[PDB]
Amino acid sequence: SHMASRPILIKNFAEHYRLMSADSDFRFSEEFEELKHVGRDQPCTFADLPCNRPKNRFTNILPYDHSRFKLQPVDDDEGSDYINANYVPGHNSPREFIVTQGPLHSTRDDFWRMCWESNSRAIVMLTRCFEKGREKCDQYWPNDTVPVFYGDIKVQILNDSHYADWVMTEFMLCRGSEQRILRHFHFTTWPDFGVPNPPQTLVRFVRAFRDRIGAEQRPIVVHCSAGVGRSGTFITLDRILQQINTSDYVDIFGIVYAMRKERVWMVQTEQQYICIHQCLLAVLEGK
C-alpha cells in the first residue's frame, strides 16, 4: 500500500537504507516528516482533568482516551482510573504492549497496580533514573532484597543479572494471598544525548529480552522518561526482528504510523527513526 505503510523487500533493505540516508538523510528526514500529525487530533479528555493533572510528567505527553490503560476505579477517588499509559500494538497482538511514562514517586503505586491489573509479566525500562543531572524516572523498585510494599503490591527481588548495557531483575509480586513473578529489563546504557552508538547494543538487548520473554500473551510494560521516544524505538525494533523470520518484508514506517495512532509521538525523533533502520541494517548484514 502507500499511505500508512511503506514496506521494503528485505533483499533490498541495505540499498533502501543507502538510498534513504543519502543527501543528509534527505528521503529519511522527509519520510519521517509525514508521521508528524498522526493521531494528534484524538481527544485526551481524562488525562486532562484537574485531578489527573499532577499525574503527568509532561503536559504535552498525555494518553489518548481510546488507547489509555485504565486502572480499576476506586470509589472515593475521583479520577482514580487514570495513569499515563496506552496499549500499543506489537508483533503478536494489538494490545501487546502497555507503554507508559517513567513513574513519578507520586505515581509508582499506580504504576505497580497497572502491572498487577494488566497481568503484565515483564517491564522494560529504557532510561536511567538520572541523566546529565535531571530526574527521568523515580526508583519504583527496591534496591535491595528487603521486600517493599507499593500500595497493596509487595515487590521483592528474587535475583538480578547485571550485564554490559542492561540489568535483568526478577521480582516476586504479591497481592493478598496471590503471587506472580515479573521480569524487569533495564537498559542502562543509552547515551545522555543522541541514540545508542553503536546501535548494536540496543539490538543485543532486544534479542536478550525476546529470547527471555518468549511468545508472551499478557501485556509487556514499556517505559522511558516520557514513554514516547525510546519506548517507541524499542517496541518497533522488537517487532521487526521477530518479523524478518516470517516475511521477506519489513514495514518500519507502517509500524510507527500504527503506534502514533495509539499513543503520542511514539518514535519521537528522526534520529531514532533512522536508528531503527541502522539496527536492522546491522542484523541483515551479520553485525
From Swiss-Prot:
Coiled-coil boundaries: none
Subcellular location: Membrane
Domain of life: Eukaryota
Active-site residues (renumbered): 224
Domain Tyrosine-protein phosphatase: 28-283
Residues reported to bind substrate: 192, 224-230, 268
Tissue specificity statement from the Swiss-Prot or TrEMBL entry: In 9-12 hour embryos, expression is specifically seen in the anterior commissure and its junctions with the longitudinal tracts.
Note: This protein is translated by readthrough of a stop codon. There is currently no sequence that provides the identity of residue 1632.
Function of the molecule: May have a role in axon outgrowth and guidance.
Family the UniProt entry places it in: Belongs to the protein-tyrosine phosphatase family. Receptor class subfamily.
Name of this chain's protein: Tyrosine-protein phosphatase 10D
Native species: Drosophila melanogaster (Fruit fly)
Full-protein positions shown: 1250 to 1531 of 1990
